[PDB]
Paper text:
Here we describe a systematic approach to generating modular and rigid repeat protein oligomers with coincident C2 to C8 and superhelical symmetry axes that can be readily extended by repeat propagation. Repeat proteins are composed of an asymmetric structural motif that is concatenated several times in tandem within a single protein chain. From these building blocks, we demonstrate that a wide range of unbounded fibres can be systematically designed by introducing hydrophilic surface patches that force staggering of the monomers; the geometry of such fibres can be precisely tuned by varying the number of repeat units in the monomer and the placement of the hydrophilic patches. All multiplexes follow the naming convention CsHRN_Rr where s is the cyclic symmetry, HR stands for helical repeat, R is the number of repeats in a single chain and N is an index to differentiate between multiplexes of the same symmetry.
We also expressed a C2 dimer directly as an eight-repeat duplex ([name]), and the structure by X-ray crystallography to be close to the design model (r.m.s.d. compared with design model = 3.78 Å).
Residue numbers in the entry:
A (entry chain B): 8 to 19, 33 to 54, 56 to 257, 260 to 272
B (entry chain A): 7 to 19, 21 to 23, 27 to 54, 57 to 272
The structure:
């Protein structure tokens, strides 16, 4: 029967694998209601006969119609032509997260990442998006959009570190400053701060963590590294962690 | 019509009604999606039980993500990964299913069984942030083409720490853009070590070396990475950062030699 649904949707088998059959029906059912290139791409997948790939494409395609951005529909077509499940999935995440983002910058950025089709960028962007969506600050979501727009794997990975590290500190000041760093959008500041926060949390001193949030807010790359040095060596005297924290204050 | 038929036929087969609801809505994407979800459940008990929750939801995005994770749980052929996928299907969060799909898919394409073992663990923990961060380290190890990095990625994935994975994926990524085979070589050494403070401190140096655009700086940075001394990376990072700000092409090469 599945071949019938794929055959009807195709026309409008010899292998006989249900999943592939249904999977492709999706790829064609989604293409036929979309972009001439989209329909053409969906066909190429059907000829491929890959269970995993057909779904990822349909998924990126399903997410392409939800945003509406034809650039997303056209970008999904090229990913369908590339036929790499890694690229499709990572773009699915960025697209899915941009939709749940509630930001048109994020949606516009996500479509841009789809065109470029860089797997590494989309995943790192999807991280920064996943964190901004959980942070609950309108400014952070736009910071992520700005980051995703730049299409830089390093800033996304450096900012995601800072956001992730702040969320584990439970310190509103640290989170407040973390969103500030994403706005600034500087890879060198985020990493220098990512160290400080990482080293404060590991030392497990609220005064160290809050001192770090102070450093982050100030956003002075050299100062974070100076404290990172002072904080690192103490980690290697609970009496002393407070000293370097106060000094950083 | 066939969509509701295929879903209904598979729905009759020990299913827990929902098919009538989906049929009443008459959405193909949801219908084909759920059909795939149930089809994958039948051949695979909690999965069959879990798939019904998806069917009643009538959500196109979740059904595919779940079906995808299910499809990959079959190709891995690891029972633990099947059960893990069922718990994710019970949640019905397309984000977790997607991020886990990647880790599972990337672990399958890696060829390391430690990795596939790890990928299954990630599905059980169902941590959206860890699955993505690991997927990075995995995606980067599969592209590096050094069997040790893949096993390094498996170890990282095994520990289930988003910080170490994000710090390591940073150095690996930073090394791949350096074009320096020794930097890439040292980057694989860092991931094996598995130290977050070391990788970050090194990620800094590399970030600064690449930015300054001095091959001496990069090769010096790679030397630092090989040593793996966190305190020494930050010292050079400070010396390197301040040259990147002034732009003294004569100075950058000076602090690069100092790092040796």
């Amino acid at each position: 029967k599945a071949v019938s649904l794929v055959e009807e949707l195709a026309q409008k088998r010899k292998r006989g694998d249900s999943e592939v059959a249904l999977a492709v029906a999706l790829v064609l059912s989604l293409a036929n209601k979309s972009s001439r290139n989209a329909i053409e791409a969906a066909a190429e997948i059907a000829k491929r006969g890959d269970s995993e790939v057909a779904l990822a494409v349909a998924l990126v395609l399903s997410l392409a119609n939800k945003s509406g951005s034809r650039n997303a529909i056209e970008a999904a077509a090229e990913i369908a032509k590339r036929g790499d499940s890694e690229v499709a999935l990572a773009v699915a995440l960025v697209l899915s997260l941009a939709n749940k983002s509630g930001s048109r910058n994020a949606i516009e950025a996500a479509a841009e990442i789809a065109k470029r089709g860089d797997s590494e960028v989309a995943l790192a962007v999807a991280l920064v998006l996943s964190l901004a969506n959980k942070s609950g600050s309108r400014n952070a979501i736009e910071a992520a959009a700005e980051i995703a727009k730049r299409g830089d794997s390093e800033v996304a990975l450096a900012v995601a570190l800072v956001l992730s590290l702040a969320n584990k500190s439970g310190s509103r000041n640290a989170i407040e400053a973390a969103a500030e760093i994403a706005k600034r959008g500087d890879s060198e500041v985020a990493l220098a701060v990512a160290l400080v926060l990482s080293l404060a949390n590991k030392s497990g001193s609220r005064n160290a963590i809050e001192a770090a949030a102070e450093i982050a807010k100030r956003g002075d790359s050299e100062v974070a590294l100076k404290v990172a040095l002072e904080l690192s060596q103490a980690n290697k005297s609970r009496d002393e962690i407070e000293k370097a924290a106060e000094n950083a204050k």
